[PDB]
Amino acid sequence: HDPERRQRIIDAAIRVVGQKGIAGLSHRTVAAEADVPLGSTTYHFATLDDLMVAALRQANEGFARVVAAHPALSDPEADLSGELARVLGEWLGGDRTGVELEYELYLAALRRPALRPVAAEWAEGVGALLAARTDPTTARALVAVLDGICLQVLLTDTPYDEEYAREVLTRLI
Amino acid sequence: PERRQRIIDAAIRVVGQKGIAGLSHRTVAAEADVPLGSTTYHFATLDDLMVAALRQANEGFARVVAAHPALSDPEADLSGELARVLGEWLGGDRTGVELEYELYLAALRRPALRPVAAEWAEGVGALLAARTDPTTARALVAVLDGICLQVLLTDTPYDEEYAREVLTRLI
Numbered sequence: 001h002d003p004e005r006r007q008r009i010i011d012a013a014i015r016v017v018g019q020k021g022i023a024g025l026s027h028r029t030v031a032a033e034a035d036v037p038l039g040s041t042t043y044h045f046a047t048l049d050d051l052m053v054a055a056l057r058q059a060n061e062g063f064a065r066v067v068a069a070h071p072a073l074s075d076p077e078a079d080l081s082g083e084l085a086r087v088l089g090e091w092l093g094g095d096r097t098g099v100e101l102e103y104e105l106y107l108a109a110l111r112r113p114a115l116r117p118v119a120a121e122w123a124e125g126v127g128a129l130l131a132a133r134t135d136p137t138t139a140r141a142l143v144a145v146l147d148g149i150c151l152q153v154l155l156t157d158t159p160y161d162e163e164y165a166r167e168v169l170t171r172l173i
Numbered sequence: 174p175e176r177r178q179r180i181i182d183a184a185i186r187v188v189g190q191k192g193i194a195g196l197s198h199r200t201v202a203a204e205a206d207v208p209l210g211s212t213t214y215h216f217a218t219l220d221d222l223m224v225a226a227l228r229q230a231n232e233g234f235a236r237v238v239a240a241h242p243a244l245s246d247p248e249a250d251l252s253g254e255l256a257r258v259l260g261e262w263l264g265g266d267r268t269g270v271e272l273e274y275e276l277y278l279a280a281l282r283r284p285a286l287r288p289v290a291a292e293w294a295e296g297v298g299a300l301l302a303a304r305t306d307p308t309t310a311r312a313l314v315a316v317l318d319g320i321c322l323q324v325l326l327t328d329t330p331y332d333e334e335y336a337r338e339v340l341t342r343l344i
């Protein structure tokens with residue numbers, strides 16, 4: 001263990017990615033942005049994948065916090081659809097650097113097998129909140145659809161339509 | 174007209190093997206055995222290169238709908254029919270599936286590609302939206318992406334009856 005030097009490094013990885021993107025993520029630049037010695041970076045994350053895996057892992061940590069601040073998601077007395085659409089609305093609107101950053105790391109799992117189990121983590125922990133309410137097959141669905149709705153906004157560059165989102169989300173539950 | 178195309182076919186090859194990282198104007202010119210930089214005459218920025226590559230790769234899907242008239246048939250189980258064309262694409266060699274996705278998902282942070290990624294989004298829409306309901310039309314594309322990435326990113330097999338269920342719930 002060496003939490004802080006390690007922790008500073010991860011934060012700088014996230015900072016480097018959001019700024020220059022996955023392409024601008026090397027040990028020298030993380031070392032620089034973290035302002036720690038190059039050897040400390042190669043010591044804690046031998047490979048770049050290790051570093052990305054830890055970064056994404058941390059980005060996921062934040063979704064949980066968001067679910068924690070919005071009790072309606074756990075209140076089996078509230079409209080899951082309308083409530084989810086809303087949270088997404090808030091996440092999507094309000095600095096895409098955080099959004100793009102997290103998504104870039106996540107989508108990176110497509111080619112880098114290392115990131116797949118950490119990608120799967122996100123999903124298994126998100127359907128968790130939906131599976132705790134509805135059945136498991138509807139959870140697996142929601143997590144999937146929900147992803148496609150964000151991607152549809154982030155990729156096509158067409159604004160987020162909360163009502164549409166709530167309707168399509170409703171068709172699954 | 175045939176040099177632009179040779180440069181394109183090349184980029185699709187570069188990505189299929191080195192991913193988007195390997196696409197470098199010189200990597201393409203090298204792959205298409207064309208004068209270095211000659212690629213710049215047709216595509217100024219790398220962004221232009223990718224937009225053309227994505228626009229050409231994105232056509233695969235239109236073809237498969239053609240070879241499966243059963244999807245244009247208003248009186249046919251779209252869900253199961255779709256769940257099928259999807260299992261075919263996700264079950265045989267992912268290099269095609271991967272390179273197309275990488276280019277498409279690249280839109281994420283390269284505004285250039287947004288319009289292309291959106292083109293294909295309505296194409297697929299109307300190409301099976303006109304089957305009434307505007308909503309179902311745009312939600313179809315999103316549910317497809319989700320169903321796909323859920324496979325491609327977590328490294329868990331494509332469950333067809335599951336896809337069908339989800340699709341059936343949408344339609």
Ligand SMILES: Nc1ccc2cc3ccc(N)cc3nc2c1
Nearest residue numbers: 062063066087088091106147150
């Ligand atoms: N790949 C994804 C998909 C959906 C997401 C929805 C979110 C909502 C709130 C938040 N704070 C972070 C989120 N991250 C996501 C990452």
Ligand SMILES: Nc1ccc2cc3ccc(N)cc3nc2c1
Nearest residue numbers: 233234237258262277317318321
């Ligand atoms: N972004 C996407 C989403 C779904 C897709 C489904 C497909 C099915 C057959 C095929 N030949 C190409 C496809 N491309 C896709 C690209």
Ligand code: NI
Nearest residue numbers: 186187190204
């Ligand atoms: Ni070759």
Ligand code: NI
Nearest residue numbers: 241257258261
């Ligand atoms: Ni077929």
